[PDB]
């Protein structure tokens, strides 16, 4: 009913999954709970499943995220306990536990953390019929039956009939024996099966037969069976049929099954995981009920139903699931695009799925079945390549667990038009043509030829024979790839790089829309969740920075805005009002604009003038030369907020005490602290200052200091008293600093077309090359990247952007504009440039001799360059990786307790690692002393290291260490714990004496 005439919601998948869960999965799980009766009198407690009612959360989301509490709902079910002596059943409602609730965006709040549930792709239960060719002889044919639990009832055939099951570890097993054990009398078996001559010539249980509803259906499909859907059990007729098909495969009457086909796979959504978690929680609850009944019998007391049930199992189960499950990950909130793209991921790796190493090559390639249902250019780069992928824009999840795609039906009928979400297996038996119909050759139009898809193949057929047509432009891609303008002119390899780099953008202090776009930024910003959308019609009577008042139908609703908040990836979140006071807004329109969004469209970068030429080497490899205008005009300024927290953990000996007056500290510090041991709001701090001062008696000084690189204003501090832990808990003090970061040498910039670079010099505007207009270019890029990485759409974008800037237009172009004609992008770009040149009379914009190229001058000398250069205004983004974060340096500070090597990590102030591939290079160069120094006194030799500082301060020569490092000594100790000795035992060549080194 929805998504067949417009782009569906990006978060509709999680929405419908959570809805189906709450609708049916809770009741289905509550139905299967057993009747607790563990006694001689058989005192029985029961839960009335019909009286299942969830309750609204006691706290709001804005309070859960603030107080680090979970956002859940209360499950109340009426229960009846029939006592043995009372001979009656008292009925009361019990609080089983809390069930987490999902937001409209798909995210859940557990312990104050935003977490998303990534979907998993698992093979569907069924019969599979693979084959394998033997080294010598005929090819072996095998049929595997897959169960919901994961049972494998294999069947094999040798050169003879030899219908042997591979269930047993032994050589083989008799299929006739299995059929006789099933119930067959050895006569009806041969009577029912086809080709009975072959069968007659040849002369644990619950989990294998636990076929799902899906399993039943599939079994019926492959092996024609009329077994009702309800009977989801491995019937012997199914086995008989399986055998029949297997023998038939030997004579050529069969078709093997492709296990990479989607129709053979199921998708597990948040509902499937929540249902299993609820079942496990119910099992734990039944165990706890049995235990408390056993205890009440020991204490000679018949208790009320409330006394039996405790709220622990449900809460602890859901908490452990959200905390430790491999398919529950924290939401990435670097930019609004990440929030939406995170919930569309489909993963092969997971609990019950292929591990990175396990996955065969075949698993990781596109299968023709993935067309329109999965993204063919969005994967995870690394060892898990081809195992983590996204979900198509127009896809939906089906009733049977299969992803479905929208296909138009061009076949003539009563309606003559349909949009059907065909499942993966069904679209194979259809002629799907993605081409247009704008061709006439003096014959009827239906006689024209067009490429089409049939039986997982490509072929050319007449328009009379095509049943389906793929009209939607964004049907075969995902949100990440669809945001790439002119994607047809870019290589498929660079598309993945561009999709990955769009995810890294940092929201800037100011936002500007893109001149050239694909038109998906609107719905992206709509479904991102960082936008204020009204839920009621009315008028905006009052406008304020903190809140917005919307008066409608005699009711006033207040919407709270976000003012300089902090995301999970240290990126600022802020919202600004868009609508003025006194205008009407419908239910759905935009009230305010969040970060990285202006005018309701996603805006992850800026539009700057760009020239493609080499400049004095500053552009070698990939490197960008940028002007100072981007610096002193705050074009790429961004705000980053980092949090630091230390809990006041109360030890058994003494609790921690927070005092401002702490001795043994210099007077230059502690200025920011208040009367209480905490920094004040609005205080500028730097590296090595004290944020929270604690006496820590148990006295000492476990304080909070700033690390290297932390220089920002203290925006807010929170004193968080922790409760609900069944006992007094430590208070938490969270400080927040805001670091304004400008664009600097070493920062990464990127373009939507896969172009990435690192700034190398900030030249002034006077030295920058200027156009014939007189304006200096903002950035200069290397023109040799285009033939290397094969990105041609960037040129188009630059030019169209120049044209737009001059004519004050914004172009939202759907991909694959060459379906209309040939060189449609080129025609559009050249036409818009000419118009700009005519309207604003700048002849330079369109040069008839070389369209799209102009001749610029040098800022230094003032002489024109020989060849023309490309001048445009592309959309450049600033990436999260920044130099400040990557800078690091260690002299001699801290060591590991056991290894005694220097520590790891930039935050921990640790050195760099000399691996085996570097020791090899050092040995090849022949630098023995450098290797020895690095392996002993710069790393592990405690005495030598202690002496190094003294020798360097005094200035004396550092002697060569002769003792063994701590790593070797450790080995000796370990090996001798393993009862193995190790002695150096050096022998002097002078006097032939053995000397042990300890």
């Amino acid at each position: 009913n929805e998504g067949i005439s417009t782009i569906p919601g990006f978060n509709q998948i999680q929405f419908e999954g959570f809805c189906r869960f709450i609708d049916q999965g809770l009741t289905e799980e509550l139905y299967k709970f057993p009747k607790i009766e563990d006694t001689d009198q058989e005192i029985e407690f029961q839960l009335f499943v019909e009286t299942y009612q969830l309750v609204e959360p006691l706290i709001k989301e804005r309070d859960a995220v603030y107080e680090s509490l979970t956002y859940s709902s209360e499950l109340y079910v009426s229960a009846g306990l029939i006592w043995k002596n009372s001979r009656d059943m008292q009925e009361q409602t019990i609080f089983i536990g809390n069930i987490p609730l999902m937001n409209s965006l798909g995210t859940s709040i557990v312990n104050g953390i935003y977490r998303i549930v990534i979907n998993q792709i698992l093979q569907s239960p069924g019969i599979y019929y693979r084959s394998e060719l033997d080294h010598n002889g005929i090819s072996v044919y095998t049929g595997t039956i897959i169960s919901d639990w994961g049972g494998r009832s294999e069947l094999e055939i040798d050169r003879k009939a030899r219908i042997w099951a591979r269930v047993s570890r032994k050589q083989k097993i008799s299929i006739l024996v299995l059929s006789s054990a099933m119930g067959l009398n050895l006569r009806e078996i041969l009577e029912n099966v086809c080709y009975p001559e072959i069968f007659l010539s040849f002369l644990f249980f619950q989990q294998r037969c636990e076929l799902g509803r899906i399993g039943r259906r599939n079994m019926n499909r492959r092996l024609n069976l009329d077994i009702p859907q309800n009977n989801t059990f491995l019937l012997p007729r199914d086995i008989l049929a399986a055998a029949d098909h297997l023998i038939g495969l030997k004579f050529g009457m069969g078709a093997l099954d492709d296990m990479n086909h989607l129709k053979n796979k199921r998708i597990r959504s948040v509902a499937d995981l929540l249902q299993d978690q609820f079942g496990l929680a119910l099992v734990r609850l039944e165990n706890v009920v049995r235990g408390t009944i056993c205890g009440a019998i020991r204490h000679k007391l018949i208790p009320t139903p409330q006394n039996l049930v405790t709220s622990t199992p449900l809460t602890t189960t859901y908490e452990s699931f959200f905390g430790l499950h491999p398919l529950s990950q924290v939401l990435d909130r670097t930019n609004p695009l990440t929030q939406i793209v995170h919930g569309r991921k489909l993963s092969y790796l997971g609990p019950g799925g292929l591990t990175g190493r396990t996955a065969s090559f075949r698993i990781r390639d596109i299968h023709p079945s993935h067309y329109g249902r999965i993204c063919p250019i969005d994967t995870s780069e690394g060892i898990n390549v081809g195992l983590i992928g996204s979900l198509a824009i127009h896809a939906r999840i089906g009733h049977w667990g299969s992803l479905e795609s929208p296909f138009y039906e061009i076949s003539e009928r009563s309606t003559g038009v349909r949009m059907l979400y065909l499942s993966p297996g069904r679209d194979e038996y259809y002629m799907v043509a993605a081409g247009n119909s704008l061709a006439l050759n003096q014959d009827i139009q239906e006689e024209q030829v067009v490429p089409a898809r049939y039986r997982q193949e490509f072929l050319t057929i007449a328009w009379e024979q095509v049943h389906l047509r793929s009209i939607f432009p964004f049907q075969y891609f995902s949100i990440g790839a669809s945001l790439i303008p002119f994607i047809e002119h870019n290589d498929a390899n660079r598309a993945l790089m561009s999709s990955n780099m769009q995810r890294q953008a940092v929201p800037l202090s100011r936002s500007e829309k893109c001149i050239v776009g694909t038109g998906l930024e609107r719905q992206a910003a709509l479904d991102s969740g960082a936008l204020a959308i009204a839920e009621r019609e009315g008028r905006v009577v009052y406008t304020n920075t903190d809140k917005i008042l919307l008066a409608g139908n005699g009711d006033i609703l207040s919407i709270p805005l976000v003012i300089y908040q902090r995301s999970n990836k240290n990126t600022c979140m802020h919202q600004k009002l868009q609508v003025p006071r006194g205008k009407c807004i419908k239910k759905g329109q935009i009230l305010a604009d969040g970060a990285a969004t202006v005018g309701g469209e996603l805006a992850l970068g800026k539009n700057v003038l760009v020239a493609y030429m080499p400049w004095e080497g500053y552009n070698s490899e990939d490197a960008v030369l940028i002007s100072e205008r981007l610096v002193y005009e705050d074009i790429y300024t961004s705000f980053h907020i980092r949090k630091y927290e230390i809990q006041t953990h109360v030890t058994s000996q003494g609790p921690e005490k927070v005092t401002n007056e702490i001795p043994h500290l210099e007077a230059h510090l502690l200025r920011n602290l208040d009367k209480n041991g905490i920094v004040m709001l609005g205080s500028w701090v730097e590296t090595g200052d004290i944020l929270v001062g604690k006496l820590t008696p148990q006295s000492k000084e476990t304080c909070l200091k700033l690390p290297i690189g932390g220089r920002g204003r203290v925006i807010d501090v929170r004193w968080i008293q922790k409760r609900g832990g069944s006992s007094y808990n430590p208070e938490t003090i969270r400080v927040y600093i805001l670091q304004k970061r400008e664009i600097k040498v070493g920062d990464k910039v990127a373009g939507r077309h896969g172009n990435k670079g690192i700034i190398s010099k900030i030249l002034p505007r006077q030295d920058m090359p200027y156009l014939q207009d007189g304006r200096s270019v903002d950035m200069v890029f290397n023109p040799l990247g285009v033939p290397s990485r094969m990105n041609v759409g960037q040129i188009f974008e630059c030019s169209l952007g120049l044209a737009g800037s001059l004519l004050d237009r914004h172009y939202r172009i759907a991909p694959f504009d060459e379906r209309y004609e040939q060189e449609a992008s080129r025609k559009l770009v050249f036409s818009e440039l000419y118009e700009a040149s005519k309207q604003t009379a700048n002849p330079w914009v369109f040069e008839p001799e070389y369209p799209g190229k102009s001749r610029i001058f040098d800022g230094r000398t003032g002489n024109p360059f020989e060849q023309p250069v490309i001048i445009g205004k592309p959309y450049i983004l600033k990436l999260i990786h920044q130099v400040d974060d990557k800078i690091h340096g260690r002299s001699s500070g801290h060591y590991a307790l056991v290894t005694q090597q220097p520590l790891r990590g930039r935050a921990k102030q640790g050195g760099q690692r000399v691996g085996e591939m570097e020791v090899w290079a050092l040995e090849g160069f022949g630098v023995a002393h450098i290797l020895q120094e690095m392996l002993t006194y710069k790393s592990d030799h405690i005495r030598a290291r202690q002496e190094v500082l003294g020798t360097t301060i005094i200035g004396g020569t550092i002697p060569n260490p002769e003792d063994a490092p701590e790593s070797f000594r450790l080995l000796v100790r370990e090996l001798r714990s393993l009862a193995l000795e190790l002695n150096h035992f050096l022998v002097s060549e002078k006097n032939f004496q053995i000397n042990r080194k300890e």
């Binding site: 100072e628 002193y632 005009e633 609005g682 500028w684 730097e686 200027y770 014939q772 207009d773 007189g774």
Partner: protein, 48 residues
Amino acid sequence: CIGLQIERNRGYLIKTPHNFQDGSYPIDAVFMPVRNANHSIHSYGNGN
């Protein structure tokens, strides 16, 4: 009520004293009055 300090300099100024007397915030300033400039050299056609 707000106070302002006006200074005359050249080029762009980096707000170096972020840590300074409380209640006063330093703003980076660009002292470039000329926004853009351009020149063109056309011939006079005077023969030799």
